[PDB]
Short mmCIF file of N, CA, C and O in Angstrom, two decimals:
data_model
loop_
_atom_site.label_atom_id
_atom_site.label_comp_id
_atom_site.label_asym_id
_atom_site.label_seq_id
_atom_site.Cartn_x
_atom_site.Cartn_y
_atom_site.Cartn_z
N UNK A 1 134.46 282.05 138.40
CA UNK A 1 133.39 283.08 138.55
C UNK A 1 132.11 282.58 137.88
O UNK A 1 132.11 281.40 137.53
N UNK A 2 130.79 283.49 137.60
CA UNK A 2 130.02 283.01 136.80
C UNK A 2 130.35 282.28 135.82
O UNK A 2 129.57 281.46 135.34
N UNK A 3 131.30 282.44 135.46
CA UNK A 3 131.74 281.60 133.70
C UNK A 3 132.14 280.56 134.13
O UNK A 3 131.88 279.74 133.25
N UNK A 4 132.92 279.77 135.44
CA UNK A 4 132.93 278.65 136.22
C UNK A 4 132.24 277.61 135.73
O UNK A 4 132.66 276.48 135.50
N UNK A 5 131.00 278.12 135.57
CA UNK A 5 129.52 277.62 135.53
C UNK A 5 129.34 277.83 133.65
O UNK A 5 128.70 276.87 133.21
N UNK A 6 129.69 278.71 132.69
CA UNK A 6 129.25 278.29 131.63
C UNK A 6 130.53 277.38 130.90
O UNK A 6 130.46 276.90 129.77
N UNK A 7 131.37 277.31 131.56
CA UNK A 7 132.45 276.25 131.23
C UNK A 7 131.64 275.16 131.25
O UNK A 7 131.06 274.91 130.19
N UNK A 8 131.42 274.33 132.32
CA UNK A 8 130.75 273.28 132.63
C UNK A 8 129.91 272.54 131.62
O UNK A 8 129.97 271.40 131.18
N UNK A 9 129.00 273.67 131.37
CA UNK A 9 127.79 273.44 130.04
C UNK A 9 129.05 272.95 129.02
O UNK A 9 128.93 271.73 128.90
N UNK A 10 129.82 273.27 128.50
CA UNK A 10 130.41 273.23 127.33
C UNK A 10 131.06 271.79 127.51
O UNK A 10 131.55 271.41 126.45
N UNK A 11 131.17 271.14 128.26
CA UNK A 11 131.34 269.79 128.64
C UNK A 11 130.27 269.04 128.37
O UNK A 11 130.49 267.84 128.47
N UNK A 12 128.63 269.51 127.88
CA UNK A 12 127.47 269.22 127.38
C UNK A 12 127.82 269.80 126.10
O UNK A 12 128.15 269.04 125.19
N UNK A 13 127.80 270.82 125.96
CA UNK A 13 128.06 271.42 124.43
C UNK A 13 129.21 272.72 124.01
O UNK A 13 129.33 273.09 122.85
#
């Protein structure tokens, strides 16, 4: 879902 997407970031930070 949206959070799909703030997972991702967290692979940056």
């Amino acid at each position: 879902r949206l959070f799909d997407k703030i997972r991702q970031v967290i692979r940056k930070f």
